[PDB]
Amino acid sequence: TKGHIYVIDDDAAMRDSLNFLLDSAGFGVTLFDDAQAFLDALPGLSFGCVVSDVRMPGLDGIELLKRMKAQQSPFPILIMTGHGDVPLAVEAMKLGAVDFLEKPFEDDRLTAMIESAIRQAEPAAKSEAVAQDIAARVASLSPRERQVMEGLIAGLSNKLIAREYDISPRTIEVYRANVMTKMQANSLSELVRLAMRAGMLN
């Protein structure tokens, strides 16, 4: 499939149009006629592009952009607006929507817009996937390796790590080697970067 689209709109006419033009274009589709049906589903939705009514009851463009950011979703979001509501869509753009379409619109404008939005959002998809794995790599260290790693990324030398965590200075190099291989880090430098993505530096 060419991408999956989650459509949110209380107008059955719109849901039916979009389901048609998107299927006839090769995308998968899930329709939500109800705001909390979409929210209830969001934490186990796989990656896809959201196409939402800018004035969905309960979940307008601003409201949706805030809940998507709060749930830290990398799903790109397109906003469907009527001409009178474009000021509202603009506020959704300032909160990170990818684009908006004012109604009526041509189908190929929307499909083009969807392809582009999916292409632009896949780096942050892959990024959050990598942050997931990094967290798993951290979780897998032994408590002594977690100690050495905390030290290294805090900037401590071999001896300061050794007297802070009370470890023979002759074995730091060894827990460091184990940390590096389990973190798949090629240098202190990269180990600290991995730590930052993991949120162990704040």
The residues of the shown chain that bind Mg ion, judged by CB under 5 A, are 10, 53
Could you tell me the smallest distance in angstroms from the CB atom of residue 58 to Mg ion? 11
Please identify, using beta-carbon distances, which residue of 5 and 8 lies nearer to Mg ion. Answer: 8
Listed in sequence order, the DSSP H helices in the chain are 12-23, 35-41, 61-70, 86-94, 107-139, 143-154, 158-164, 169-182, 188-198
Please identify, using beta-carbon distances, which residue of 60 and 99 lies nearer to Mg ion. Answer: 60
Total count of residues recorded for the chain: 202
Cβ atoms of 61 and 81 within 8 Å: the answer is: yes
Could you tell me the smallest distance in angstroms from the CB atom of residue 53 to Mg ion? 4
Could you tell me the smallest distance in angstroms from the CB atom of residue 16 to Mg ion? 14
Could you tell me the smallest distance in angstroms from the CB atom of residue 82 to Mg ion? 9
Please identify, using beta-carbon distances, which residue of 10 and 107 lies nearer to Mg ion. Answer: 10
Could you tell me the smallest distance in angstroms from the CB atom of residue 129 to Mg ion? 33
Residue 4's φ and ψ, nearest 5 degrees, are -110, 140
- Here the contacts of 98-101 (C-beta below 8 Å, separation 24 or greater) are 100/54, 100/61
Alpha-carbon Rg for the chain, nearest whole angstrom, is 23
Both tokens of 76, joined, read 């790109």
Please identify, using beta-carbon distances, which residue of 9 and 145 lies nearer to Mg ion. Answer: 9
Please identify, using beta-carbon distances, which residue of 53 and 99 lies nearer to Mg ion. Answer: 53
Cβ atoms of 121 and 130 within 8 Å: the answer is: no
CA atoms within 13 A on the CB side of 89: 20
Could you tell me the smallest distance in angstroms from the CB atom of residue 9 to Mg ion? 6
Distance (Å) of CA 178 to CA 73, 169, 183: 33, 15, 8
